Homo-oligomer: A and B are copies of this chain.
């Protein structure tokens, strides 16, 4: 029995007896993700190189993927009439939606994750976290400052060899594969669970000289297992969306701890850490900063940064033990 994202969301909406506003918001997301996917795959690039004549700004004067993606997400989410506040990785201030388009939801998103991998064509993506506004006050940024544990839905779209949307809600994590031939997301994995233990560690070891003792010790074990067991294999794509997705399906651990240049970690709490921590906990995994649960941090800034360790429970647990081992 074929099941598309469209049918799945609509039905989950019926089972929860929703009024239909969130379902409309998710349908908008779906559409946004497809438009970004098409532009990311370079559809119609021939026009920029003068196939129809008029080869004007054939350099850098037209929308760069980062910006185009941010416009699609904002414009589409707005037009869903289900949001009131929006937080983008590409915007300094929270985006307060006009009253005539205002909804009860707050969305925190990363329109195009994997910044440094854009020019080399490595996998990139979009990340999103949705909150139900809780307060009778007028829309402001504080409405997006809720701890991740208050997330109603979170997930991401991966633009890789193929495009896949991973959606996580109260009752589980579901994976949908995009069939570009018909512009439809097909459910291929129902209520997914990450393996208890993996054999892959993911981190940028270029910061070796800045790692804290716990991280430094953990890495030593993956390369030189004290029990002489087989060493973990290493993998680091460079785009958080890509590295987290492999972690979800293959197992293992992903890491981005603090360092000199980034004392509180590089990844942002609102639209990078929380959505992935939610997807991970719902899949049966763990997401810690090393001292606490990511979903428990009470955000104080819109672009606040936080250190994160996520993946299989046994692999993450072992690293927490190291942290405690170091007082």
Contacts and interface: CB of A to CB of B under 8 A. Distances in A.
Contacts of A201: 206
Given A1-B50, A52-B68, A160-B122, A6 B27 contact: yes
Contact of A223 (B1, B75, B205, B237): B205
Interface residues on A, range: 35 or more
Contact of A75 (B2, B4, B14, B245): B2
A317 interface: no
Q: How many copies does the complex hold?
A: 4
Contact of A10 (B24, B164, B204, B238): B24
A182 B183 contact: yes
A177 B120 CA distance: 12
Nearest to A34: B182
Contacts of A234: 204-206, 236
A170 interface: no
Interface of A: 1-4, 6-7, 10-11, 13-14, 19-20, 23-24, 27-28, 30-31, 34-35, 38, 40-46, 49-56, 63, 68, 71-72, 74-76, 78-80, 101, 117-124, 158-164, 177-184, 186-188, 201, 204-209, 222-224, 231-238, 242, 245-246, 249-250
